[PDB]
């Protein structure tokens with residue numbers, strides 16, 4: 001009814017030289033996985049990224065970005081490390097929080113994946129506000145043009161545009177998936193930690209590009225809330241959907257990121273309760289209309305266990321919301337739980353809706369395509 005993408009205490013990765021990575025799971029396995037991100041290509045291939053937390057579930061720990069690839073509809077997976085941390089600090093070196101896009105970049109189908117990178121910081125990234133930007137931080141971008149088989153680093157100007165801004169201590173993708181606009185523009189939702197002198201600690205925004213190499217920041221900022229967020233393209237707006245303790249928040253920009261205003265069809269429509277949680281938000285066509293599909297946790301215990309990871313439909317015209325499927329109807333592991341990522345595709349006449357999510361330190365996959373008629377009708 002499901003498959004395991006990455007098995008907690010059940011995977012063995014190799015490093016760049018081909019030596020095994022001895023984690024703290026049983027038998028020297030990778031201990032824990034978090035923060036899944038997925039896409040589906042024009043060939044039907046599914047690629048899933050996650051934080052491979054070799055030693056512990058903690059955010060401040062030794063982490064590589066794993067990638068899993070399935071060509072059989074999610075039944076079986078081939079796995080590797082896509083992005084290695086710098087191996088400065090055996091406790092703390094890390095790459096974190098993947099956000100991915102599958103896109104047509106000047107004719108070439110490309111998977112992009114963006115992760116934050118730290119080495120010696122022993123605290124959460126929001127603690128580091130003294131510098132513009134933090135010297136321990138980077139935001140790195142990798143690509144594949146071979147359907148997810150190989151990844152290579154992309155040289156970008158992302159660090160430069162953050163430095164030039166001068167009011168950002170660190171930036172990170174919004175977690176899960178970014179998007180390619182109908183005109184071809186690449187867009188990553190972002191989270192930013194502002195420098196200490198800015199009265200808002202966190203903001204949301206996006207970065208955009210034509211070629212995947214040269215990126216830009218818009219001039220405005222959206223309120224941060226819990227900062228993890230996704231963007232959809234709708235009706236001549238970019239619309240975000242942001243983590244927040246309690247009710248999720250959604251804003252729209254009609255001027256390509258200069259200004260943001262509340263988006264009534266999604267704002268305050270789903271409750272994640274205490275702490276909030278990352279959620280995934282995408283669009284799915286229905287005729288010449290769109291529906292938003294959204295995944296996040298109901299959090300019945302009002303805590304970090306983030307129970308009941310659920311799929312919702314948002315009617316973008318009426319503002320109705322309904323629960324489609326509580327696809328992980330379980331209490332999570334409070335060491336780190338609740339995150340998810342959706343992926344919709346129509347290849348020829350075959351429509352697929354997939355999800356990956358956190359399940360007790362593992363990453364699981366489900367094919368949710370049977371729900372498509374219900375979601376599409378919600379317009």
Ligand SMILES: CC(=O)N[C@H]1[C@H]([C@H](O)[C@H](O)CO)OC(C(=O)O)=C[C@@H]1O
Pocket residue numbers: 034035059096097116124125126172226227228336337
């Ligand atoms: C880069 C990073 O730390 N990401 C982490 C994120 C973050 O700490 C929080 O959004 C405050 O910034 O929180 C969580 C979480 O399970 O809630 C998981 C992520 O691994």
